[PDB]
RNA sequence: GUUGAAACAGGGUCAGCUUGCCGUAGGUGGCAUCGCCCUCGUC
C-alpha cells in the first residue's frame, strides 16, 4: 500500500454529469486519483488500485469558466478556429485541495517476464519520494497539478474530521474491461462514497 | 506506458460634453499710565 498524498492548489474531478459546466467531484475521484497514480508509474504489467482516498484540505469551491473548446480535432478538418468552436465551461473547481490517496496495485495478465510487484512497488516507491513521474499528475484536468508527496503514514492534517458528507454515488474508475489495448470500449463504475467519516475508504470491483 | 485529453475572455469602446461660489458684510463701540518718589548725605 502506498499512501501518497496529492495536493494542488486546483482540482476538478469533474462530475460526469456536470460535464459541460464542469462542477467538480467534491473530493478526488478513485479514477482521477489512480490515474495520478498512473501518472507517476504505470506499465501494462501494474494495475493501479486506490484503497482509500483521505481528503486534506475542505471541499472548498471556485467557479472558473473557461472559453473551452467545443469539439474534438479531427484528421477531417485541419483547425477548429475557435472562434467558431468556442464553449464556455463553467469550472466549479475544487479550491487548496490534497488528498492522500492510500493505493496499491495489482498485476495484471499481461504482466510479462518481470512481474515483480516489489519491482513496481519500489519503482513507484522511488518516483514519489524522487518526485518522478511518466505525468505531472492531473487533479482531474492536466491544468491542475498533483503536488505530491509519497507520505509513509501520515504528514498532513485531514478536516473532515468528525463523520462528514456522503458526496453519494461518485464516479469510481472507468470500467476498461471490455476494452481492447487503449480503452475503446469503457463503462462507468461508481460507488457510494462510502461517507466521508474522514477520508473515503473506496470499494475494489 | 491503456485511462480527460484539446480548450481565450476574447476582439474593443474618451465619460464624456460643461457648469460664477457665489452675491456682501464696521471690528467694532472706548478705555488716564497712571497716582508719586530730596540725589542725595559731605569732602
Known amino acids: 500500500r502506498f499512501i501518497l498524498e496529492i495536493s494542488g492548489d486546483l482540482a476538478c474531478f469533474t462530475r460526469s454529469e456536470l460535464k459541460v459546466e ?9 479514477s482521477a486519483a489512480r490515474n495520478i497514480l498512473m501518472a507517476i508509474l504505470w506499465k501494462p504489467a501494474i494495475r493501479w488500485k486506490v484503497l ?8 472548498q469551491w471556485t467557479n ?3 472559453n473551452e473548446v467545443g469539439t474534438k480535432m479531427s484528421e477531417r478538418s485541419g483547425s477548429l478556429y475557435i472562434e467558431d468552436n468556442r464553449q464556455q465551461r463553467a469550472s466549479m473547481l475544487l479550491k487548496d485541495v490534497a488528498y492522500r490517496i ?3 496495485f495489482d498485476m ?4 510479462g517476464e518481470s512481474d515483480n510487484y516489489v519491482k513496481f512497488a519500489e519503482m513507484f516507491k522511488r518516483r514519489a519520494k524522487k518526485g518522478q513521474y511518466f505525468h505531472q499528475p492531473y487533479l482531474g484536468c492536466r491544468e491542475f497539478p498533483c503536488d505530491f508527496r509519497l507520505l509513509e503514514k501520515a504528514e498532513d492534517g485531514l478536516p473532515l474530521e468528525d463523520i462528514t458528507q456522503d458526496f453519494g454515488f461518485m464516479l469510481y474508475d472507468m470500467d476498461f474491461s471490455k ?3 487503449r480503452d475503446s470500449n469503457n463503462a462507468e463504475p461508481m460507488f457510494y462514497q462510502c461517507k466521508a467519516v474522514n477520508g473515503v475508504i473506496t470499494v475494489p470491483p
Open 64 to 66: 472558473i469558466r473557461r
Open 52 to 59: 482509500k482516498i483521505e481528503i486534506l484540505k475542505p471541499i
Open 102 to 104: 492510500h493505493a496499491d
Open 179 to 181: 476494452s481492447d489495448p
Open 22 to 30: 464542469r462542477v467538480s467531484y467534491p473530493v478526488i475521484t478513485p
Open 108 to 111: 495484471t495478465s499481461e504482466a
